[PDB]
């Protein structure tokens, strides 16, 4: 319910008081909270997109890593065909990446590395990935 959505909001926004790079352990806490709230996945996606819109530039790569971790965990746990998160994140993905590329110069390579992993592993189709690579 909305208690699980609130708990996800709390877990993700707590990053703003932590120094990047963000730990594997913290990412697991955020990802477990996302999956706990999966019956309200639309709210989870909205919260992650809000984080990426609002956060300081140092937190753009952490925000992208949250998308990566959630989408991969969901595909792993539920199957590539049944995952709700990838398709939902795909709706506003252009706007999301326009925000991510406001990161500091030394972080752009980290965004391109994730897009190349998504392409190679079929997390999204090339029709989605290529324009995001072109944006870099």
């Amino acid at each position: 319910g909305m208690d699980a959505v609130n708990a996800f909001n709390q877990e993700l926004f707590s990053l703003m008081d932590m120094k990047p790079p963000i730990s594997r352990a913290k990412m697991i806490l955020i990802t477990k909270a996302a999956i706990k709230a999966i019956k309200l996945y639309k709210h989870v996606v909205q919260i992650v997109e809000k984080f990426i819109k609002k956060c300081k530039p140092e937190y753009k790569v952490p925000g992208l890593y949250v998308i990566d971790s959630i989408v991969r965990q969901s595909r792993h746990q539920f199957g590539t065909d049944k995952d709700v998160f990838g398709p939902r994140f795909s709706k506003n993905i252009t706007a999301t990446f326009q925000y991510l590329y406001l990161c500091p110069s030394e972080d752009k390579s980290k965004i391109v590395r994730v897009l190349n992993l998504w392409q190679k592993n079929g997390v999204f189709k090339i029709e989605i990935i290529q324009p995001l690579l072109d944006m870099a």
């Binding site: 790079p21 963000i22 594997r24 952490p62 971790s69 746990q77």
Partner: peptide
Amino acid sequence: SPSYSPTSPSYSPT
């Protein structure tokens, strides 16, 4: 504490 890596495998529900 080790940093998140996008090549690290997903966890199994422990």
